[PDB]
Amino acid sequence: MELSFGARAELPRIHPVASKLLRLMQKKETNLCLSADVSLARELLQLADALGPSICMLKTHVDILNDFTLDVMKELITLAKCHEFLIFEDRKFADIGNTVKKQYEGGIFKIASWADLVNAHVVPGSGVVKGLQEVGLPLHRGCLLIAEMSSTGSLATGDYTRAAVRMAEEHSEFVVGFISGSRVSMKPEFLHLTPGVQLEAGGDNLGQQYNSPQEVIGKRGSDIIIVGRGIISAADRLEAAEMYRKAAWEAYLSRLG
Amino acid sequence: ELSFGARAELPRIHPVASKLLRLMQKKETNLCLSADVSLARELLQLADALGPSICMLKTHVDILNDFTLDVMKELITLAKCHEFLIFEDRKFADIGNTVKKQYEGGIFKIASWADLVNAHVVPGSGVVKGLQEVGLPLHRGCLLIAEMSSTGSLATGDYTRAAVRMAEEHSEFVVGFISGSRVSMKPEFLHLTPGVQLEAGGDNLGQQYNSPQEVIGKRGSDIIIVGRGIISAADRLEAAEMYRKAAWEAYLSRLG
Numbered sequence: 001m002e003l004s005f006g007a008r009a010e011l012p013r014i015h016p017v018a019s020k021l022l023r024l025m026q027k028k029e030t031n032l033c034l035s036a037d038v039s040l041a042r043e044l045l046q047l048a049d050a051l052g053p054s055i056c057m058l059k060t061h062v063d064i065l066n067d068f069t070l071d072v073m074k075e076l077i078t079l080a081k082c083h084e085f086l087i088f089e090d091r092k093f094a095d096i097g098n099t100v101k102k103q104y105e106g107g108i109f110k111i112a113s114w115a116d117l118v119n120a121h122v123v124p125g126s127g128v129v130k131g132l133q134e135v136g137l138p139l140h141r142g143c144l145l146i147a148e149m150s151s152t153g154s155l156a157t158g159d160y161t162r163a164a165v166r167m168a169e170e171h172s173e174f175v176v177g178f179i180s181g182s183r184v185s186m187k188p189e190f191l192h193l194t195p196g197v198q199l200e201a202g203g204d205n206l207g208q209q210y211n212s213p214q215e216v217i218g219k220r221g222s223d224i225i226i227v228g229r230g231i232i233s234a235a236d237r238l239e240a241a242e243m244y245r246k247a248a249w250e251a252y253l254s255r256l257g
Numbered sequence: 258e259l260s261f262g263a264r265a266e267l268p269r270i271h272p273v274a275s276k277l278l279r280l281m282q283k284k285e286t287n288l289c290l291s292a293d294v295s296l297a298r299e300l301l302q303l304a305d306a307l308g309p310s311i312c313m314l315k316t317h318v319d320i321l322n323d324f325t326l327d328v329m330k331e332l333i334t335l336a337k338c339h340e341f342l343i344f345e346d347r348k349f350a351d352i353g354n355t356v357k358k359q360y361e362g363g364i365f366k367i368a369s370w371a372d373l374v375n376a377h378v379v380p381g382s383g384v385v386k387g388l389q390e391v392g393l394p395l396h397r398g399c400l401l402i403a404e405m406s407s408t409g410s411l412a413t414g415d416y417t418r419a420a421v422r423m424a425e426e427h428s429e430f431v432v433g434f435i436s437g438s439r440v441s442m443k444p445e446f447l448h449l450t451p452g453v454q455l456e457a458g459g460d461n462l463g464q465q466y467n468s469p470q471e472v473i474g475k476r477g478s479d480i481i482i483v484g485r486g487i488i489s490a491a492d493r494l495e496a497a498e499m500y501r502k503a504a505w506e507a508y509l510s511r512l513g
């Protein structure tokens with residue numbers, strides 16, 4: 001039988017990062033991840049502060065921040081702790097294991113030092129996960145595997161998706177879920193996060209495709225919606241975030257019965 | 258089979274591909290150094306010393322502890338002096354709207370200094386359309402990852418065929434592939450092959466190695482990409498020369 005987020009947080013094989021997430025989702029009545037796709041640190045932080053109470057997670061693309069510093073990420077962590085959300089760097093690691101370990105720990109971004117969660121493509125084989133684990137496990141972090149993509153012509157289908165699920169289930173000490181369009185694992189210890197979400201039908205001019213929160217959470221059985229432009233391009237980002245939160249949360253409840 | 262110099266003149270050749278092919282012929286090198294280091298000073302010292310031996314220097318900018326745009330300016334100076342291209346191995350792999358910003362912007366401003374970048378094809382062709390919005394105006398080229406060297410790679414069969422079709426349909430920007438072998442029969446595309454060492458072996462995190470003779474001679478690729486085989490050696494110049502000579506002779510042999 002289908003379990004609430006709060007009960008899933010207690011499952012025997014739950015990862016600590018997933019448990020923390022699931023608990024705050026239930027506490028705050030939110031399964032919304034804000035995709036904070038902005039180029040200005042000040043806007044990132046103003047969004048994180050104002051929308052923090054409405055979100056379970058803030059997803060970053062640190063490599064698009066024109067004025068990235070590690071101090072910016074310190075300020076973001078303060079907001080994450082204050083408002084209770086996880087930080088997810090959407091880095092899409094996708095190289096051989098030896099390379100991704102350095103890309104995760106080092107360089108200018110030092111992603112592992114501030115990101116609760118990262119994601120990885122499965123195309124290199126399981127070495128990508130083993131490499132990331134060498135950094136992530138000691139730093140008490142989690143990882144999401146990209147099992148499906150939202151964009152037109154995605155090759156993350158069929159056997160590829162099945163491979164991502166197997167890879168996750170075999171690295172459960174580090175991998176806590178998926179980026180996917182629907183439920184892809186039957187194991188309730190895994191999170192499903194779905195991008196390509198807007199209230200209205202449509203897409204963008206570079207292959208993005210949208211589905212609604214009701215469709216993704218209610219019909220397709222995903223856990224969390226990831227929303228960027230549907231919120232960020234709106235005049236009132238707070239009201240937009242609230243609309244998305246209420247949509248995703250009610251769809252979750254209804255599926256739960 | 259056409260020489261690199263003849264391929265540089267093909268009707269449908271991309272200007273970046275042509276520049277590369279001409280300097281490969283001129284310098285007798287089809288070696289790409291994978292400069293997998295964390296210090297700018299080591300990067301630049303390798304680029305200067307090994308520049309005459311290489312057709313290309315591949316970077317992972319996001320592992321450089323002391324990256325600045327001025328470091329990349331110095332690398333360009335070396336690239337112009339010694340005549341090699343700069344390839345940032347970023348493996349763009351997101352939706353089109355996102356990758357365009359990751360390519361043009363942020364701290365790294367990759368498009369401002371990288372002649373070549375690469376991309377995974379898993380998102381569908383929007384990844385290439387997004388990149389080309391930035392890269393076409395900046396006269397850049399791109400490589401699509403058709404195959405990977407690592408154990409368990411899913412870049413096989415229909416996935417590889419999709420990479421080839423995507424390249425062939427974006428030939429104004431895509432100049433070739435990262436692959437383990439020749440994957441396109443069209444001589445205007447370059448094939449660059451990582452997972453290369455002289456000796457048999459691998460690493461502890463899924464990397465698998467094949468020799469330059471195997472990759473260039475038997476598998477029909479154009480360029481070898483070599484990191485640790487050179488970088489971990491005491492004398493990196495002599496190591497680079499060993500790889501250069503291996504790859505170049507394998508190419509000549511195939512050419513007949």
Ligand SMILES: CC(=O)c1cc(=O)[nH]c(=O)n1[C@@H]1O[C@H](COP(=O)(O)O)[C@@H](O)[C@H]1O
Pocket residue numbers: 035037061090119146148149150151179195196197208226227228229230351352355
């Ligand atoms: C989250 C993720 O891994 C990813 C995968 C994918 O298939 N689709 C997608 O849009 N994304 C990302 O989500 C965000 C979608 O933003 P949008 O709502 O279209 O403005 C972007 O920041 C994408 O880079």
Ligand SMILES: CC(=O)c1cc(=O)[nH]c(=O)n1[C@@H]1O[C@H](COP(=O)(O)O)[C@@H](O)[C@H]1O
Pocket residue numbers: 095096099291293317346375402404405406407435451452453464482483484485486
């Ligand atoms: C170049 C490329 O796209 C790539 C793809 C791949 O399938 N295998 C691979 O090793 N690479 C990269 O080449 C280099 C190989 O370095 P190595 O010679 O194993 O020390 C690394 O910097 C990898 O990130």
